[PDB]
Symmetry: D2
Subunit: 121 residues, 4 copies
């Protein structure tokens, strides 16, 4: 993990994220999207749980992106929860939650759920 997580990742929809996995569980970087009310690079911050593993499991991690930068303010944020699997074809499999700020009446419809798989290629 850590060294293996650090780098550029791409998902099926064309988004890209560059992350640095720091020694004490931190994940920092930028996300450049391909879809949504997004436009350019947004800051991302997260954490990963580093473990000695002896059975080939993935490294659990998660990060958040608030969709606001100097060109767009979508009033929403997305969090990705998943795990990193390294190797030949290292990947990060995730499920995400995208919440939009709504009025109380519409809060019941404020969150979308989806999944994304990121690869190094």
């Amino acid at each position: 993990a850590e060294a293996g997580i650090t780098g550029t990742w791409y998902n099926q929809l064309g988004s890209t994220f560059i992350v640095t996995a720091g020694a004490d569980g931190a994940l920092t970087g930028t996300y450049e999207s391909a879809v949504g009310n997004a436009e350019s690079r947004y800051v991302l911050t997260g954490r990963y749980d580093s473990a000695p593993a002896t059975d080939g499991s993935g490294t659990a991690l998660g990060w958040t992106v608030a969709w606001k930068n100097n060109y767009r303010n979508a009033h929403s944020a997305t969090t990705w929860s998943g795990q990193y699997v390294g190797g030949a074809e290292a990947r990060i499999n995730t499920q995400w939650l995208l919440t939009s700020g709504t009025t109380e009446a519409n809060a019941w419809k404020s969150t979308l759920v989806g999944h994304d798989t990121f690869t190094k290629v």
Copy 2:
């Protein structure tokens, strides 16, 4: 938001989190849980999307907690996605995803989903 988010929040299960909402969308603090393979305080990091609002909507935000500290290493991480609503009875309504590192065979059962509401009281 920001000033209103900064502070101590409590949820229905007895967990507590203290956060500082920084001027440029950052959320940093600690989470002390009440349930799970948790024990003590864990670092939390996230982002919030600050907007001029003129219709009473909530502020979208999200944060991550990797469940590893000096006393526990649960090999998992949780991400909360939701929005802050301020006022008399300010609250943060969220939905969360908890992913555990698993082997490929068990990846299909690696993520739990739930929701939490935090209040200042």
Copy 3:
């Protein structure tokens, strides 16, 4: 379960559902909503997993409602997954997924997630 599930249930938003839990795991009834692109009663169908329990656990169950009836066709369907807990204050705690038919380009934003608690009162 079964006998205890059969009846009228109400949730926090004002929706109501009447169900009959049949001897072999079937759930049939109608859902009358309070929110959404809904208007009147819709047919609901589902299943519940009946078990001999000796430790007070809930009965897992799930149902689906396609939001189409003689007055509305919202092009969407919602599924509720949860469990029934009986007793003095019997309740059905659920998490739901609402999917809308979209074009391929928008499929990534086709599903909303939420939770509902139903009571007999």
Copy 4:
């Protein structure tokens, strides 16, 4: 939809489901799994929202499977929410919620979330 939904579907993990989409929104059939505390065929019931479409969108639908049959009683149920897209490579893209009956103390960890894509091949 309807005629196009009726038939045998397969997902990436080796599970199979045979469904009949009836004229008035009903979905009935059997699910034979490949993973979990499953073993053989289980009854499935659901609904789909049939619409006149003029822009190539998918048909929203959902179904439930209680994991109990004559050989297994897993005390759990899964609901799939998604949409059918027809054509050359017709598919049903879904997100699912699997809830297990738990005690109140463990209800917070009773639901798993995932996604599955089914094809006719």
